[PDB]
Amino acid sequence: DDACNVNIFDAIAEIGNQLYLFKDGKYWRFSEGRGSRPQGPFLIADKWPALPRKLDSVFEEPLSKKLFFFSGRQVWVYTGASVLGPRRLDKLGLGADVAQVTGALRSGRGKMLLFSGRRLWRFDVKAQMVDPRSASEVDRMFPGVPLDTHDVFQFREKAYFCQDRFYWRVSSRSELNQVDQVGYVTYDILQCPED
Amino acid sequence: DDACNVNIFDAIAEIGNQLYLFKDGKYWRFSEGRGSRPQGPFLIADKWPALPRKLDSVFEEPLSKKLFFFSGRQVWVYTGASVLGPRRLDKLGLGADVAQVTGALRSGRGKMLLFSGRRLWRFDVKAQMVDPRSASEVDRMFPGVPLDTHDVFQFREKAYFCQDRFYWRVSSRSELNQVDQVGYVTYDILQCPED
Secondary structure (H helix, E strand, O other): OOHHHOOOOOEEEEEOOEEEEEEOOEEEEEOOOOOOOOEEEEEHHHHOOOOOOOOOEEEEOOOOOOEEEEEOOEEEEEEOOEEEEEEEHHHHOOOOOOOOOOEEEEOOOOEEEEEEOOEEEEEEOOOOEEOOOOOEEHHHHOOOOOOOOOEEEEEOOEEEEEEOOEEEEEEEEOOEEEEEEEEEHHHHOOOOOOO | OOHHHOOOOOEEEEEOOEEEEEEOOEEEEEOOOOOOOOEEEEEHHHHOOOOOOOOOEEEEOOOOOOEEEEEOOEEEEEEOOEEEEEEEHHHHOOOOOOOOOOEEEEOOOOEEEEEEOOEEEEEEOOOOEEOHHHOEEHHHHOOOOOOOOOEEEEEOOEEEEEEOOEEEEEEOOOOOOEEEEEEEOOOOOOOOOOO
16 A cells, blocks of 8 residues: 555565565565655565565675565575575574574675574575574664564665664664664655655 | 654753753753653743753752753752852863763762763762763763763663764663663653654
8 A cells, every 4th residue: 555654564675776665465665865755556476476475574685686585484585586485494594493584684794694583693695504603682782772673674884673663773883783863664764744 | 832842952851750851941841650741841041040041961969959050161050049150160170171061870879970972070979079080981881872962861760861852771780881772752751742
């Protein structure tokens, strides 16, 4: 329906020079700019027919542009129209106790951070495998972020932790992380008109 | 007009069993509860006719209950209707390089912490003095907090650092300070309605 009426998006992710928002089998696109508004709604199945109804998180590889979609304990990897999956999360090195992936962020060169609620792991892009000793508690790495965040995504070199209809933007200062802003997904991003 | 429409309060401080909010020669009084709204606005000139229109910070000294008001390189100390000041910050032992006081928090017994942007100092209440050698950086003592905060105050035994219209809350434990909450001063504190 209207992206501006959505309170909690199933998943959000930057794909190329645009931001994609997903919700119950539908998606919208958004580009930064004056007068810019959300484009859509579009049907996920029209573009990505192998995906389930509700996604948990999605992310685009900065270089190859491969697209990772997560839902429950299943992961899909699209390279254009060609899909690889579904595969179990353990095929990425994630433990059997990981029920879902709720986000991802770029880390060092050739590294990512995969989230699952209060936990996170380091992910090596080259091997497409989670690093062994990398399990960490989000709270310590990202103080100020809500403990019940449902989606974590990177947009314009910044991290966004979503909870309810808001987001907690995070920036970094000399190997440390801190929230630098709090705002509405619809109003502060998407530039939706108010009342 | 309405405290809920204010983005950046000049200063915030808890006096007695209420939270006072100041902005452009105006102030409000807030008391927690189910439905309790911010009372006001009231004229600062009415209660404290010696104070300037714009303040930087204010705090109630725990032991004596006197009120310390800061504005620029000046400080006013109120004991009921009796006023002491204005005096330059140097009278409290603050160095001549201190442009202003952005806040304060209780420290050890009889000790107070005074803030000025990125810097802070130890203040002895009994002697009403600050040793320039106690200089410390908020950045190292309070990690996870923004570099340039415009107000620092205590509320409900918790420390609040403010920037823009947000606050970074900090609770003490393991002698290591950490941000355990970040949000809107209006929505979270004051309980102002969203949107």
